[PDB]
Amino acid sequence: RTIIALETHDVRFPTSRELDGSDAMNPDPDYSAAYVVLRTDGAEDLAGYGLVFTIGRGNDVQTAAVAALAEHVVGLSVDKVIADLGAFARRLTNDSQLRWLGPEKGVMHMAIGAVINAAWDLAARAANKPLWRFIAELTPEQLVDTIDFRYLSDALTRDEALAILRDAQPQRAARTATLIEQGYPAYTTSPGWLGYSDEKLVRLAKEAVADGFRTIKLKVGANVQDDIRRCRLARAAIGPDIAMAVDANQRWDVGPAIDWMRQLAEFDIAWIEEPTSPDDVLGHAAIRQGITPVPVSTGEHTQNRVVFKQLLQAGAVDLIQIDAARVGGVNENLAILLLAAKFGVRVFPHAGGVGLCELVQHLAMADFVAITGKMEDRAIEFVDHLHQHFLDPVRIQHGRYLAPEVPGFSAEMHPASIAEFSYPDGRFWVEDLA
Amino acid sequence: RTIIALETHDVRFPTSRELDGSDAMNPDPDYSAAYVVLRTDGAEDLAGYGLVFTIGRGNDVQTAAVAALAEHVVGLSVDKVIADLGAFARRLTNDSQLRWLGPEKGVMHMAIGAVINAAWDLAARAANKPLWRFIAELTPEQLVDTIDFRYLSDALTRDEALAILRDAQPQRAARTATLIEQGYPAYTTSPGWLGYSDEKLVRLAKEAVADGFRTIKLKVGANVQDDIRRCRLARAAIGPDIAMAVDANQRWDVGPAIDWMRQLAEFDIAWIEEPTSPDDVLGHAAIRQGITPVPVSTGEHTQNRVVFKQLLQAGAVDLIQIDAARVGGVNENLAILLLAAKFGVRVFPHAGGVGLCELVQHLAMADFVAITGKMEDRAIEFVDHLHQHFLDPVRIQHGRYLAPEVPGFSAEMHPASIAEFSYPDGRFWVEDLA
Ligand SMILES: O=C(NO)[C@H](O)[C@H](O)CO
Ligand SMILES: O=C(NO)[C@H](O)[C@H](O)CO
Ligand SMILES: [Mg+2]
Ligand SMILES: [Mg+2]
């Protein structure tokens, strides 16, 4: 069997109509996916699916970046790809000319990450396993073979990664049973989009708690008076026991961030996400030093494992977000999860975007089983949008993610959805733009 | 007058045929330009030119990214653009949806930087001044109005930037005279490409010194025995007085970098460039601490001013490279140059690529006149390749850059060159690919 085509689609959803996903930095995002399919000449079931998440404009550029990887992947043996995902990833990340466009950051790296993710989807499908089990059931040797240890020898070596993975082997099966029976903790951000009225914020916050979520997140960062008012209203709506996180989406400078949080601390903050630039490691550390013990996090825009290494080394975070589509695919997220485990820093996956809940749940679950054995101390983000467009939509029960069962990364989208929302010739857009 | 079109071209040169530009990370680069033209309905002379430098594959993606900015720029008033370059830049850098593809890093940011650079070219042309004079002759107020001070309040405020620029005003004219009469120090990397034979290295090293260059640079990083042999041969060829820098192009990890340099120090190293990942601020600092006083530099791949701020704060560098096309255009490089000046760190501009010498010379010259008043303590990189394709090619005299005189950023390329090397339908490529 061989990969006979790399198909790409520019799919965009009009989330801006109701300001779903709105925040202090992105006031009107249109959740989009640079969707990719690795087609094979095997069974219709044998294909890999993946996507890069963007928020509208630029999605065509992101799609073109993914399409440019066809030369590298078309013609490859499926058996060889799924048997050495490290080699598959390296063919792309070690292309020095593509590295120049990054290296390992921005559009070109996310495009590479989507194709790598599609390869893991293909591997899991071939193994007839949901991705989280596929990953968690690989041997420690197989797992480290997929990781790029360059630039990490000062923090995580192959031998050190092997040790962590081997330490978990005895409890892998038991943890798998626990996850299947109990699900994984989740928190929701849907009640907190910044573009919503105070009335809507309160209504949704209450519905979130009524739905079983033990934690919710509010967007902040544009106006301190608005933030004080909204945080007070939300805290009153959810009660004193529910956790409430806030997210500034990179809006502040170091000094202003510390002063801003000084005005929100009274509302019992679970953590402040992305108080400043996603590139400012020293800055996050300075902010953390100034607002401690109020927890600081960042991660959804962290470009690669090298920056994550520094965030951990510098003590710039109390917890981190990981994102399924921001980095170099599964291979890179495995390195990031191992780094987090070694440094004893909790991971709260980001999932604010179309298909992100579907994808990232697998990484968190694989981590629980094969890496940390810890989930009750953390949570996976959840947003109540666009799940209807996926064949295997995430399922939430009493505020917890149920473990996926069908084979794959849960990335496959309904062809009808692609036909309706492809930009700009999709049925919805042709009429909307008209 | 209005901008009526944003034209883009995927131009690639077969530099890999003779391995020109080859290094430890990029063994066979094909110097390329994602060329852009801001056309107006004014005089044929009234147009802005710019380009993103890449090394081959991916240049089509980079070109597509630039093309995607047409919606933002086509239709704009030329007078309004050139009168507020800060506002022009912000229209692009503050587009939250385009920020998602970065933010301020990779393909999308370099595309934005090229269009911003083309706008500065347009402004300089309208003023009938070479870019370095256009920049250096703007008032301190006009200059700070173009800068993005976000994420820099802890290191460089608007008031602090104004102070630095105002301190230089008294000597601006005198410095301009000095530069015009003496030129700016240069160093050459052309003798050191890693793919060259020992014989070629020696021959070119000698020619470089004979041509007046007081400093040369050798590529290192793939094999320590090769590096020891080559450094010994080059040092013997140039004599004990000529400066010799080495460049590893990001190949090493922290520990290995320190051990590697321990074996090259005996050859009197001017500085080691990019010993590790361009994202590892803490890593460069650790390497610097281990090999001091051997100078450490980085910068050609530094994504934006925020990372530069940290390199300076952390004391990760002894000197830095800046690059005309890696960041957000002139606006960002002005912030970087001011940060470097405030921290008292020398700047040695990178120019290893097509059109980079032509572009970056203007930033170094503007810095000398309006910011530091220091040039004899530093140098602009030079490579002896592809200058024939530019209308205003750089001119080197006795190892020094002569100050450009014609209006513009020196980015305009010969239409004949574009027709010959456009990929893949250009005259040269249609026949070469056949
Ligand atoms: O930050 C996020 N969620 O945490 C989202 O990705 C962002 O707000 C865009 O909707
Ligand atoms: O690093 C460089 N010059 O310093 C070049 O850009 C690189 O070697 C690609 O030719
Ligand atoms: Mg967030
Ligand atoms: Mg270099």
Which of B388, B383, B339 lies closest to B360, judged by CA?
A: B383
Tokens at B394, concatenated: 């750089």
Using an 8 Å Cβ cutoff, are A183 and A402 in contact? yes
Helix H or strand E encompassing A320: strand A319-320
The CA distance from A47 to A50, in Å, is: 10
The CA distance from A393 to A358, in Å, is: 6
Q: Is the CB of B153 less than 8 angstroms away from the CB of A256?
A: yes
Residues of B in contact with A105 (CB under 8 A): 105-106, 279, 303
Which of B299, B343, B346 lies closest to B318, judged by CA?
A: B346
Distance of CA A428 to the CA centre of its chain: 27
Which of B62, B71, B91 lies closest to A61, judged by CA?
A: B62
Point out the domain boundary residue: A106, A130, A154. A130
Residue range(s) defining the domain that contains residue B248: 131-434
Q: Residue A392 in 3-state DSSP?
A: coil
B8 phi and psi angles, rounded to 5 deg? -130, 145
- Which candidate in B107, B148, B300, B309 is best for mutational testing of the A interface (most A CBs within 10 A)? B107
The CA distance from B2 to B41, in Å, is: 6
Breaks in chain A after residues, C-to-N cutoff 2.5 Å: none
Helix H or strand E encompassing B164: helix B158-168
Q: Residue B24 in 3-state DSSP?
A: coil
Q: Is the CB of A310 less than 8 angstroms away from the CB of B281?
A: yes
Tokens at A218, concatenated: 């509010």
Q: Residue B37 in 3-state DSSP?
A: strand
- On whether both A139 and A197 belong to a single domain, the answer is yes
Helix H or strand E encompassing B6: strand B3-12
Distance of CA A83 to the CA centre of its chain: 25
Distance of CA B128 to the CA centre of its chain: 23
Using an 8 Å Cβ cutoff, are A248 and A278 in contact? no
Experimental method: X-ray
- On whether both B238 and B382 belong to a single domain, the answer is yes
- On whether both A204 and A107 belong to a single domain, the answer is no
Using an 8 Å Cβ cutoff, are A257 and A275 in contact? yes
Buried (b) or exposed (e) across A156-187, using 16+ Cβ within 10 A? Answer: beeebbeebbeebeeeeeebbebbeeebbbbb
- On whether both B139 and B45 belong to a single domain, the answer is no
B154 phi and psi angles, rounded to 5 deg? -90, -5
Question: If you ran DSSP here, which 8-state letter would residue B169 be given?
Answer: G
Residues 6+ apart with CB under 8 A from B28: A96, B16, B19, B22, B195
Of ligand 1's listed atoms, the one at least distance from the Cα of A217 is 4
Angle between helices B305-314 and B281-291 (to 10 degrees): 30
- Of B25, B26, B360, best ligand 2 pocket probe by most atoms within 8 Å of the beta carbon: B26
Greatest alpha-carbon pair distance for chain B in Å reads 60
Tokens at A199, concatenated: 């009335």
Which amino acid, residue A313?
A: Q
Tokens at A195, concatenated: 């573009």
Tokens at A148, concatenated: 């790029």
Q: Is the dihedral of CA B163, B167, B173, B174 positive or negative?
A: negative
Neighbours of ion ligand 3 (CB under 5 A): A 247, 273
Using an 8 Å Cβ cutoff, are B68 and A58 in contact? yes
Point out the domain boundary residue: B130, B152, B183. B130
Using an 8 Å Cβ cutoff, are B259 and B291 in contact? no
Which amino acid, residue A8?
A: T
Strand partners, A77: A2
Point out the domain boundary residue: B130, B160, B184. B130
Using an 8 Å Cβ cutoff, are A426 and A419 in contact? yes
Strand partners, B219: B247
Of ligand 2's listed atoms, the one at least distance from the Cα of B26 is 9
CA torsion, ordered B227, B230, B234, B236, to nearest 10 deg: 110
Residues 6+ apart with CB under 8 A from A320: A297, A298, A299, A302, A308, A311, A312, A336, A340, A345, A346, A347, A348
Using an 8 Å Cβ cutoff, are B144 and B165 in contact? yes
Backbone angle region of A249, left / alpha / beta, with phi > 0 → left and psi within -120 to 50 → alpha: left
The CA distance from A186 to A356, in Å, is: 13
DSSP string, A277-314: -TT-HHHHHHHHHHHTTS-EEE-TT--SHHHHHHHHHH
Q: What are the helix and strand counts (H, E) for chain B?
A: 19, 13
DSSP-derived pairing of the beta strands B184-192 and B215-219: parallel
Residues of A in contact with B54 (CB under 8 A): 97, 100-101
| Angstrom distances, CA of residue A257 to CA of A17, A252, A275 | 30, 5, 6
A28 phi and psi angles, rounded to 5 deg? -150, 55
Using an 8 Å Cβ cutoff, are B380 and B361 in contact? yes
- On whether both B386 and B430 belong to a single domain, the answer is yes
The CA distance from A284 to A242, in Å, is: 26
Is A350 part of the annotated catalytic residue set?
yes
Ligand 2 binding pocket (C-beta < 6 A) is: B 21, 23, 26, 29, 189, 247, 249, 300, 350, 352-353, 381
Annotated binding site of B for substrate: 21-23, 31, 217, 249, 273, 300, 350-352, 381
If you measure CA to CA, which chain A residue comes closest to B157?
A253
CA torsion, ordered B232, B290, B352, B239, to nearest 10 deg: -30
Tokens at B431, concatenated: 């026949």
Q: How far apart are the first and last CA of chain B?
A: 44
Which of B9, B105, B219, B309 does the annotation list as catalytic?
A: B219
A77 phi and psi angles, rounded to 5 deg? -75, 125
Of ligand 2's listed atoms, the one at least distance from the Cα of B31 is 10
* Resolution in angstrom units: 1.7
Cis peptide before B407 (omega within 30 of 0): no
Q: Is the dihedral of CA B15, B16, B18, B19 positive or negative?
A: positive
Strand partners, B217: B245
DSSP-derived pairing of the beta strands A296-298 and A272-273: parallel
Which of B305, B331, B304 lies closest to B147, judged by CA?
A: B331
Q: Is the CB of B100 less than 8 angstroms away from the CB of A281?
A: no
If you measure CA to CA, which chain A residue comes closest to B105?
A106
Of ligand 1's listed atoms, the one at least distance from the Cα of A219 is 8
Which of B334, B265, B333, B268 lies closest to B299, judged by CA?
A: B333
Using an 8 Å Cβ cutoff, are A420 and A427 in contact? yes
DSSP string, A13-37: --GGGTTTT--SS-SS---EEEEEE
Q: Residue A212 in 3-state DSSP?
A: coil
Q: Residue B4 in 3-state DSSP?
A: strand
Using an 8 Å Cβ cutoff, are B246 and B217 in contact? yes
The CA distance from A432 to A14, in Å, is: 10
The CA distance from A230 to A197, in Å, is: 9
Q: Residue A197 in 3-state DSSP?
A: coil
Tokens at B264, concatenated: 């090259």
Using an 8 Å Cβ cutoff, are B227 and B257 in contact? no
Using an 8 Å Cβ cutoff, are B249 and B225 in contact? no
- On whether both A104 and A135 belong to a single domain, the answer is no
Residues of A in contact with B91 (CB under 8 A): none
Which of A354, A280, A362, A298 lies closest to A329, judged by CA?
A: A362
| Angstrom distances, CA of residue B320 to CA of B117, B257, B284, B337 | 21, 18, 12, 10
Annotated binding site of A: 21-23, 31, 217, 247, 249, 273, 300, 350-352, 381
Using an 8 Å Cβ cutoff, are B12 and B59 in contact? yes
Which of A62, A325, A26, A33 lies closest to B97, judged by CA?
A: A26
Question: If you ran DSSP here, which 8-state letter would residue B285 be given?
Answer: H
Q: How many CB atoms lie within 10 A of CB A345?
A: 17
- On whether both A169 and A88 belong to a single domain, the answer is no
The CA distance from A302 to A319, in Å, is: 13
Helix H or strand E encompassing A198: helix A198-210
Tokens at A23, concatenated: 């925040």
- On whether both A66 and A198 belong to a single domain, the answer is no
Scan for tokens 């801003």, then name that residue.
A260
The CA distance from B257 to A225, in Å, is: 50
Strand partners, A187: A381
Centre of ligand 4 to C-alpha B249, Å, is 6
Is A219 part of the annotated catalytic residue set?
yes
CATH number at residue A383: 3.20.20.120
Distance of CA B303 to the CA centre of its chain: 12
Which of A313, A319, A283 lies closest to A298, judged by CA?
A: A319
Q: Is the dihedral of CA A92, A96, A98, A104 positive or negative?
A: positive
Using an 8 Å Cβ cutoff, are B221 and B248 in contact? yes
Which of B278, B334, B308 lies closest to B117, judged by CA?
A: B334
Cis peptide before A103 (omega within 30 of 0): yes
- On whether both A413 and A387 belong to a single domain, the answer is yes
- 3-state SS of B400-411 is EECCCCCCECCC
Using an 8 Å Cβ cutoff, are A319 and A295 in contact? yes
- Which candidate in B23, B61, B305, B323 is best for mutational testing of the A interface (most A CBs within 10 A)? B61
Q: Is B145 exposed, middle or buried (0-12, 13-18, 19+ CB in 10 A)?
A: middle
Tokens at B58, concatenated: 């991916």
Which of B398, B406, B401, B346 lies closest to B377, judged by CA?
A: B346
Scan for tokens 């202003």, then name that residue.
A256
The CA distance from A290 to A348, in Å, is: 22
The CA distance from A378 to A337, in Å, is: 13
Q: Is the CB of B96 less than 8 angstroms away from the CB of A29?
A: yes
Helix H or strand E encompassing B400: strand B400-401
Residues 6+ apart with CB under 8 A from B56: A97, B12, B16, B29, B30, B31, B32
Q: Give the residue whose CA is nearest to atom 2 of ligand 2.
A: B352
Chain A: closest CA distance from residue B343 (Å): 16
Residues 6+ apart with CB under 8 A from A293: none
If you measure CA to CA, which chain A residue comes closest to B250?
A151
Helix H or strand E encompassing B204: helix B198-210
DSSP-derived pairing of the beta strands B32-40 and A243-247: unpaired
The CA distance from B209 to B214, in Å, is: 7
B77 phi and psi angles, rounded to 5 deg? -75, 125
Strand partners, A65: none
The CA distance from B105 to B54, in Å, is: 14
Q: Give the residue whose CA is nearest to atom 10 of ligand 2.
A: B21
Q: How many CB atoms lie within 10 A of CB A434?
A: 5
Scan for tokens 């390869």, then name that residue.
A119
B376 phi and psi angles, rounded to 5 deg? -70, -10
- On whether both B136 and B214 belong to a single domain, the answer is yes
Q: How far apart are the first and last CA of chain A?
A: 44
Centre of ligand 2 to C-alpha B24, Å, is 10
The CA distance from B236 to B64, in Å, is: 47
| Angstrom distances, CA of residue B251 to CA of B238, B273, B282 | 26, 11, 16
Which of B331, B395, B330, B328 lies closest to B357, judged by CA?
A: B395
What is the tally of structural domains in chain B? 2
Cis peptide before B293 (omega within 30 of 0): yes
Helix H or strand E encompassing A259: helix A254-262
- On whether both B296 and B206 belong to a single domain, the answer is yes
CATH number at residue A113: 3.30.390.10
Q: Give the residue whose CA is nearest to atom 4 of ligand 2.
A: B352
Using an 8 Å Cβ cutoff, are B193 and B21 in contact? yes
The CA distance from A283 to A296, in Å, is: 11
Which of B99, B185, B149 lies closest to B361, judged by CA?
A: B185
| Angstrom distances, CA of residue B62 to CA of A33, A65, B243, B326, B409 | 20, 9, 36, 12, 20
Using an 8 Å Cβ cutoff, are A112 and A297 in contact? no
Which of A385, A377, A380, A386 lies closest to A399, judged by CA?
A: A380
Which of B379, B116, B345, B152 lies closest to B245, judged by CA?
A: B379
Which of B433, B423, B416 lies closest to B54, judged by CA?
A: B423
A243 phi and psi angles, rounded to 5 deg? -75, 140
Instruction: Measure CB to CB from residue B101 to each of A27, A106, A279 and give the nearest one.
Output: A106
Q: Is the CB of A30 less than 8 angstroms away from the CB of B97?
A: yes
Which of B328, B351, B399, B408 lies closest to B151, judged by CA?
A: B328
Q: Is A268 exposed, middle or buried (0-12, 13-18, 19+ CB in 10 A)?
A: middle
The CA distance from A168 to A190, in Å, is: 34
- On whether both A411 and A321 belong to a single domain, the answer is yes
The CA distance from B146 to B141, in Å, is: 9
Neighbours of ion ligand 4 (CB under 5 A): B 247, 273
The CA distance from A422 to A272, in Å, is: 35
Residues 6+ apart with CB under 8 A from A290: A254, A257, A258
Tokens at A129, concatenated: 């396993």
Q: What are the helix and strand counts (H, E) for chain A?
A: 19, 13
Residues 6+ apart with CB under 8 A from A110: A52, A62, A65, A325, A326, A327, B101
- Of A18, A23, A194, A384, best ligand 1 pocket probe by most atoms within 8 Å of the beta carbon: A23
E-strand ranges in B260-394 read 272-273, 296-298, 319-320, 346-347, 380-382
Of ligand 2's listed atoms, the one at least distance from the Cα of B23 is 8
Which amino acid, residue B183?
A: G
Question: If you ran DSSP here, which 8-state letter would residue A387 be given?
Answer: G
